[PDB]
Design a protein around this nucleic acid. Sequence first.
RNA 1: CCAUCUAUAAUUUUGAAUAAAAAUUUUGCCGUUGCUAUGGC
Lengths: 35, 139, 24, 391
Amino acid sequence: EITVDGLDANQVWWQVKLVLDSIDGDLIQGIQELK
Amino acid sequence: QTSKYQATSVVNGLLSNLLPGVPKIRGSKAQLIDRNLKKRVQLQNRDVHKIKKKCKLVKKKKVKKHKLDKEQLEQLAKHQVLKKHQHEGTLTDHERKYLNKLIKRNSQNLRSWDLEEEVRDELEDIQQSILKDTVSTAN
Amino acid sequence: KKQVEQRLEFYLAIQEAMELYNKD
Amino acid sequence: EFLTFMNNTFEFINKITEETDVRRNLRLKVYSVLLDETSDKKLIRNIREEFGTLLEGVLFFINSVTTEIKEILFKVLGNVLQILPVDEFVNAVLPLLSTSTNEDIRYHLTLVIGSKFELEGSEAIPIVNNVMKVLLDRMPLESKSVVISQVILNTMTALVSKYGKKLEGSILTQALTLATEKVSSDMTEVKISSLALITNCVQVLGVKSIAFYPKIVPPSIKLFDASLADSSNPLKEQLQVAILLLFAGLIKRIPSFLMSNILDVLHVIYFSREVDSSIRLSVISLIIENIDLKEVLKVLFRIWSTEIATSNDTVAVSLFLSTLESTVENIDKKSATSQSPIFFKLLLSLFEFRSISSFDNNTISRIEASVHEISNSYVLKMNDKVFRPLF
RNA sequence: CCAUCUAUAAUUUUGAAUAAAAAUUUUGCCGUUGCUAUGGC
């Protein structure tokens, strides 16, 4: 989960970085298979 | 006091874990400033990685020794376990196999002392010749 | 001989924590 | 008379229990029974139950002891603890924790459980999971006794420190929640033990502990402020270190999430009088090598004008000088140019320290000497375009 | 190295006093013998 409670804008965004960066690799690979 | 000793133990342990080099828990102001500035570069030069290595090896050797006590102890009991089941005919399937391996192990060694078959062919041929003359018994 | 004699001479943590608690 | 007699009895007990042949050694006889598949399980249960009474009995005598007889019981105790393996020892001891009604015996029993795992490895992972759950369940019951609460926290700290990552996540998360709640405990002993667990728990969990971050850093900063006020606290030194180690641990594990509160971290480091300067300087070297320099330079200006400039504290001023110089020798050229207006704004404040400084001339001259060298170093590694307006 | 500036030490004010504070300026080791001197390695 991305925790937003009691955390500033930056800290939430770092949570988004770690999730989004990891999901990007699998997301790109799935796109290649579909194409 | 136990609170005191236990307080020092927990803090001291993590000092080693996180800051290997720093010591553990147990004048002109200008001079004080210089000392702190000097203390940085020499602390910055400390080889903390080696200090971590030395602790790791020391913990490893003892832990290595304690298993070597653990296994060495259990074969003694395991062989002791085998003894009474064999005497009482309580051998398991595994028990009957380890002993069977010992039959192969012990027998396999004795073949070397038993020697190979070919030399027996020449040795036996010599054997009867030396026997017949000495024993005689033709008469 | 005395000179030779001079030449001859020339050539558990759980326990502690347990005990400490008893002092308390 | 009777004292001499009991001395001889515990000697007599010591001789039999001493591990001086399969038949003679009690230890070997126990494991054989365990190794036998045909041995009745009920017989095994008797051995477990018999040991617990034996272990409780020896602990009772040691608790209620006489120096030599005190020592003899420990040789007896040492022999007893090795009778049975770690697997059955935990099984035969954990139930006795709740059964025992004496706070001393419980206090003793927790210590030995930790010692059994001091020399264990990966084979105990299922066992320690059982131990952690029991320790977690007993702590609400043992909140009344500070010593028992302190020790159970610390045994968990040892077990989380050692192969903690391999432990199941639910126990790790449960431990962090439990330690966090007791940071507010009035007893300084519970605070320091609570703080230690969070460090190891946060170390194991890493980013996954970010959910508890609002419950860790802000209370810890408030705790430090209270720490300064109660200078009569005997555990002020350990507590202040306990707060510092907490920040140091998360400065390596969550640098990015701490940068917002980095100023309060620096406040703790600057004004932690009790802690030795070596610890305080060492944690500074962690901040520089783990946290973005640009955010650091911005904060140094704010903290200087707020507190250090008016602190009139030699250690705080000197250690601030340590932070500032370290950053410039590590800040990149691109980062150097970007943060120029802030540094120069700080640099002007540094020249004007003499006006408000209460120290003598020699210190201020020495402080200025450091300021000039750093100022020269930072103006180097820059280009004309950025510097011409600032000049 | 010299000066200067600190540090250490001494006289002085408030002060029962602590306290601050202006101000100024014989052995490496082992004994014996006094309250100082010399025996052993």
